[PDB]
């Protein structure tokens, strides 16, 4: 990566131990963070590795729009990483291992925040549509299954499906994950998995509303 080679000469010039001072063990160094979405001041900033997410948002980003209680979800490492809700991001650290403990992973340290005034299903569907557009399509799992997941999410957004399909979608993701050639299939399966795992009630409520209103 650009950042790795860019920091290598400064590491050599100032020594390995100086870099190893920051962060935790096996998570040493400083990291560039992009904060985007629903914040007062979206920005890029270099910060110590294992900085808590909350103070990172409240210090450099200016805080979530409408206050911290307005926060709904955060994607800590770009579209590939699964989302996490407010409850776990209250007291989570920002590095590889502590985010893996939160079943997400650091990824590329790209924080995207969403407050309570947005359609999270719409956002995850947009991400799945992006992954559908950007897959090369040489291997059957990524190509076929990612188009299938894109269609299923598009159907979820308006609530046109039934709850028995949600688990099916989960199964579909597990068929894509680990069976493709590269990690794009994994990075398309993970957001669906996180959305389902953390907001199944939202999808179920949307399905009930659609079924009631269409009869």
């Amino acid at each position: 990566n650009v950042e790795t080679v860019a920091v290598s000469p400064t590491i050599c010039r100032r020594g390995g131990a100086w870099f190893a001072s920051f962060g935790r063990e096996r998570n040493s160094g400083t990291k560039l963070f992009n904060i985007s979405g629903h914040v007062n001041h979206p920005c890029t900033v270099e910060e110590e590795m294992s900085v808590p997410l909350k103070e990172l948002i409240e210090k450099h980003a200016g805080g979530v729009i409408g206050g911290w209680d307005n926060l709904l979800a955060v994607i800590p490492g770009g579209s590939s990483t699964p989302l996490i809700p407010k409850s776990v991001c209250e007291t989570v650290l920002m590095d590889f291992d502590a985010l893996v403990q939160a079943q997400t992973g650091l990824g590329t340290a790209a924080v995207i925040v969403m407050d309570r005034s947005t359609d999270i299903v719409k956002a995850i569907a947009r991400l799945i549509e992006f992954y559908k557009h950007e897959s090369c399509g040489q291997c059957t799992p990524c190509r076929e299954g990612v188009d299938w997941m894109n269609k299923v999410m598009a159907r979820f957004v308006k609530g046109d499906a039934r709850p028995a399909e949600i688990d099916s979608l989960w199964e579909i993701s597990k068929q894509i994950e680990g069976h493709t050639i590269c990690a794009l299939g994994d990075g398309a399966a993970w957001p669906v998995q996180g959305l389902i795992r953390h907001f199944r009630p939202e999808l179920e409520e949307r399905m009930q509303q659609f079924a009631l209103q269409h009869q």
């Binding site: 028995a164 399909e165 688990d167 989960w170 199964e171």
Partner: protein
Amino acid sequence: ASATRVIQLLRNWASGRDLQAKLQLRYQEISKRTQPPPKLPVGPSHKLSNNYYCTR
């Protein structure tokens, strides 16, 4: 059966049992030849998940 009462009495006495109760010719008591559409429920393995074929 459109049989006169005297003939019914004669046949019942000859047989020894009441024939008119259970006749061997079928009448309007049978089911209609045109029926409503059925629905025919699906089997147990018509699930959408946790239905891998290697397990069944």
